[PDB]
Design a protein around this ligand. Structure first.
Ligand code: HEM
Ligand SMILES: CCCCCCCCCCCCCCC(=O)OCCCOP(=O)(O)OC[C@@H](O)COP(=O)(O)OCCCOC(C)=O
Lengths: 431, 55
């Protein structure tokens, strides 16, 4: 596809697809959980559910409109969807919710029922969803005392002390035209969207959001949440990685694809060309693992997550996995690098060429907000095809060899050994 | 003594006894460590140590 950006006072981006049967229109702001403090942690999660509340959604469903929203660390989104010949109504609804009249939504009755609904989501998340809350605690110890540590949903202790005035203060400082991108995906022409905006003289708020004092800093650390009543052990482990607008962005993504993802109960996942699986399958040390490479405006993370029921062989799983990471600096084969090139292109093709216009609106707005434009998928494939074996060794010797780590765990983790027995496995030194 | 006083038979047998017994001590030390492995060591507080262990 082909993107098209403009600036008439308002930044308008679009990605037309004539094959789609729908159209999405929305606005993406360049502020998220990393632009908050510990006192108001969760105020962006309440704006999501106020936008999706029942009396607001009822007004939309009478004209054939569906609503969505998403809160992350670096951005926030508010999308409206419609049939292709009804995109003029999508913009009017968005006009009387952000540019005008966001006081009818913050009434007393609408704010108390919404608050009670959010306190029950975050409570069930902390007691039932173990893989995702251990990955949240990883961000909280790795980036402690910096903005990138705060959870995106909020906490139960900070949510209870939020009143209406906290919602209005956060909007005056962040929902600004200088911090906003208007997006359009699916079956919508680029020129029909901009002329519709020019015929209304819209302006959210002018600009100059706050300054954000501290930068993100990685600290080697651990946090353990032991619970012997649960039936598994959930563990995550990472080093410091690459931010966006880094030269090593795609080299870190390719090195995670070398070790990849595993499911013990799927037969075809046991046959992948991954050397680590010859050690794990002898005694069945885990149920699943997945390797990630996450990237933000200021820093990143590189590592893996696992879940297991073999609570007596945890130390052999962590040991064998970290000995394969060492091979990226010493001994990594040309065959392993060509496999990972092909599967990474398939992974990026499914993410960017899905059918949903709502997913494409979130990717487009976040990219334009953070580098001014969007890289094509044909240009990204050429960068991936130009990575050599020497490039992986240079990246790993800087980022992996003899470097500090962050750890988080929950469940039956008595068999997870101390920090320094694990820190020592990051360098071979039988060498 | 091997005779009627501390004499040459006494000194020659004391040296041969003296080389042996250090090797009997080495076997009592192995048995000593085996009895420590089944319950482990104690601690200066005198309570259980199974809640906080390091390698
Ligand atoms: C060649 C002589 C000996 C050797 C090599 C030896 C070796 C050891 C070692 C390595 C330990 C574990 C670490 C420690 O507790 O310091 C230990 C513990 C112990 N030894 Fe010895 N030992 C010897 C003689 C003795 C003697 C003569 C006694 C008592 C009459 C004794 C009684 C104990 C006890 C009660 C413990 C356990 C202490 C505790 O866990 O609190 N050992 N020994
Ligand atoms: C007729 C009955 C016996 C027949 C054969 C019995 C074989 C003995 C051990 C076989 C069983 C091993 C499996 C575990 C078990 O249940 O037994 C414990 C073995 C003895 O452990 P340990 O040697 O006291 O360790 C004690 C540790 O400190 C390791 O020992 P280390 O200090 O390295 O010792 C070397 C020092 C001197 O040794 C010499 C010269 O003999």
């Amino acid at each position: 596809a082909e993107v098209t950006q403009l600036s008439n006072g308002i930044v308008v981006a679009t990605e037309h697809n004539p094959s789609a049967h729908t159209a999405s229109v929305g606005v993406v702001f360049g502020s998220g959980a990393a632009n908050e403090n510990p006192y108001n942690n969760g105020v962006s999660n309440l704006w999501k559910n106020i936008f999706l509340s029942k009396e607001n959604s009822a007004v939309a469903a009478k004209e054939g409109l569906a609503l969505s929203s998403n809160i992350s660390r670096d951005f926030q989104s508010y999308i409206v969807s419609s049939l292709p010949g009804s995109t003029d109504k999508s913009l009017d609804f968005l006009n009387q919710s952000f540019i005008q009249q966001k006081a009818n939504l913050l009434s007393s009755s609408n704010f108390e029922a919404t608050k009670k609904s959010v306190l029950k989501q975050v409570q069930d998340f902390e007691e039932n969803d173990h893989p995702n809350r251990v990955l949240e605690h990883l961000h909280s110890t790795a980036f402690q005392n910096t903005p990138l540590s705060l959870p995106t949903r909020g906490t139960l202790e900070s949510l209870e002390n939020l009143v209406v005035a906290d919602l209005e203060s956060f909007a005056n400082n962040h929902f600004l035209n200088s911090n906003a991108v208007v997006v359009g995906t699916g079956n919508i022409k680029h020129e029909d969207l901009v002329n519709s905006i020019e015929s209304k003289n819209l302006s959210l708020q002018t600009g100059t959001k706050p300054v954000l004092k501290k930068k993100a800093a990685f600290l080697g650390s651990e946090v353990r949440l032991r619970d012997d009543t649960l039936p598994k052990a959930w563990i995550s482990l990472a080093v410091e990685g690459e931010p966006v607008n880094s030269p090593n962005y795609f080299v870190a993504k390719l090195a995670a694809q070398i070790f990849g993802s595993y499911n013990a109960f799927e037969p075809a996942s046991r046959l992948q060309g991954i050397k680590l699986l010859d050690n794990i399958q002898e005694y069945q040390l885990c149920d699943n693992f997945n390797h990630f490479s996450l990237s933000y405006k200021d820093s990143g993370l590189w590592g893996f997550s696992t879940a297991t029921r073999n609570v007596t062989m945890i130390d052999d799983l962590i040991h064998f996995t970290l000995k394969q990471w060492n091979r990226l600096t010493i001994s990594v084969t040309d065959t392993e690098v060509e496999r990972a090139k092909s599967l990474l292109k398939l992974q990026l093709g499914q993410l960017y060429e899905s059918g949903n216009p709502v997913n494409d609106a979130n990717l487009l707005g976040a990219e334009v907000l953070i580098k001014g434009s969007k890289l094509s998928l044909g240009e990204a494939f050429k960068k991936i095809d130009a990575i050599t074996v020497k490039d992986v060794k240079a990246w790993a010797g800087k980022r992996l060899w003899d470097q500090d780590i962050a750890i988080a765990g929950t469940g039956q983790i008595e068999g997870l050994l101390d920090y320094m027995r694990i820190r020592s496995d990051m360098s071979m030194m039988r060498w | 003594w091997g005779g009627f006083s501390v004499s040459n038979p006494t000194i020659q047998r004391f040296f041969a006894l003296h080389y042996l017994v250090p090797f009997i001590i080495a076997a009592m030390v192995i048995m000593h460590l085996m009895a420590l492995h089944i319950h482990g060591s104690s601690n200066p507080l005198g309570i259980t140590g199974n809640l906080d262990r390091i390698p």
